[PDB]
């Protein structure tokens, strides 16, 4: 058959799952340390006092 001129140029692309904006949590300033450290600091604080 004899095609006509392309009316839509395309190709092979890459599709991935759209990511999320990862809205920071309210209490995210605690993230640098683990929950165990934060809990142990309170225990250490009480003990020292």
């Amino acid at each position: 058959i004899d095609f006509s001129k392309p009316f839509m140029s395309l190709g092979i692309s890459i599709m991935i799952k759209k990511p999320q904006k990862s809205k920071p949590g309210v209490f995210s300033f605690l993230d640098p340390l683990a929950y165990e450290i934060w809990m142990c600091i309170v225990f250490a604080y009480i003990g020292v006092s």
Partner: protein, 43 residues
Amino acid sequence: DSYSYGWSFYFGALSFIIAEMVGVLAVHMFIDRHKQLRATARA
């Protein structure tokens, strides 16, 4: 080795608080015992 801590873990964490608070209350009783002795032995 997701994990979580149970009540038995928090039973020893609560016991720590109760123990430190009892230790403080016992130290006050000791300071109270000696304060009375000093005050009685002053007048």
